[PDB]
Amino acid sequence: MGPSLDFALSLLRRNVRQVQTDQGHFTMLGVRDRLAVLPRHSQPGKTIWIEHKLVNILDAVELVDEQGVNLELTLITLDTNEKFRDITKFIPENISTASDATLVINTEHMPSMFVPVGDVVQYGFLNLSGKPTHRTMMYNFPTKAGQCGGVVTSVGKVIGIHIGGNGRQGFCAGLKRSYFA
Numbered sequence: 001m002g003p004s005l006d007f008a009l010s011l012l013r014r015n016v017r018q019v020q021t022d023q024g025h026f027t028m029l030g031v032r033d034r035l036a037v038l039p040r041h042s043q044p045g046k047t048i049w050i051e052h053k054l055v056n057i058l059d060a061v062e063l064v065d066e067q068g069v070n071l072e073l074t075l076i077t078l079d080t081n082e083k084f085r086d087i088t089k090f091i092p093e094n095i096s097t098a099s100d101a102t103l104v105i106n107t108e109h110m111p112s113m114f115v116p117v118g119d120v121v122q123y124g125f126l127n128l129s130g131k132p133t134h135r136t137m138m139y140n141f142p143t144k145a146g147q148c149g150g151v152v153t154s155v156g157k158v159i160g161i162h163i164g165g166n167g168r169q170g171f172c173a174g175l176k177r178s179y180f181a
């Protein structure tokens with residue numbers, strides 16, 4: 001097997017989880033230790049269903065920028081035995097565009113799903129259902145509901161978490177390594 005498929009299948013295997021909150025199904029990315037990230041609008045409660053079992057959330061941190069604008073990412077710390085494979089090395093130090101990126105979705109309804117989004121490019125401000133959002137990026141692919149939390153990647157580098165769309169374009173919250181320090 002080639003390398004870009006291996007990396008994506010490895011992600012699926014040890015870092016990308018099927019989850020359910022009171023808001024529906026999402027893809028969850030485990031980053032390291034007991035630390036994971038979800039789209040802010042998944043609104044994780046005191047517990048979250050992960051794959052096959054209810055897992056308690058010890059702490060949740062919705063990220064905003066330095067003038068307090070939404071970044072659309074929640075950092076959750078899980079009460080689990082498992083430590084995630086530390087993938088913080090694959091996350092750039094600053095938000096990074098990409099070409100020929102792939103969106104990795106993993107949900108009960110959309111399991112192990114690989115979506116050839118295009119090049120990924122910058123955006124900044126997004127109006128997502130009345131929530132103004134910064135540090136977002138864009139890909140000209142018609143993503144759809146149920147794909148939030150999906151992992152944007154290209155060439156072994158984890159760069160965004162899918163958060164929204166419009167039927168012709170998809171938008172992710174950019175990832176940077178300092179979020180997970």
Ligand SMILES: */C1=C/C(=O)OC/C=C/CCO[C@@H](c2ccccc2)[C@H](NC(=O)[C@@H](NC(=O)c2cc(C)on2)C(C)C)C(=O)N[C@H]1C[C@@H]1CCNC1=O
Nearest residue numbers: 024041127128129131143144145146148163164165166167
């Ligand atoms: C991802 C998750 C999903 O389907 O779930 C259920 C959705 C619940 C409602 C909340 O999710 C919306 C949201 C995101 C961030 C902050 C607040 C709310 C989100 N909203 C949208 O994507 C909407 N689009 C826009 O507002 C918009 C602005 C610009 C510019 O372009 N689009 C909505 C589609 C009108 C949401 O539903 N995200 C959802 C994935 C998208 C559904 C449609 N295509 C997607 O990629």
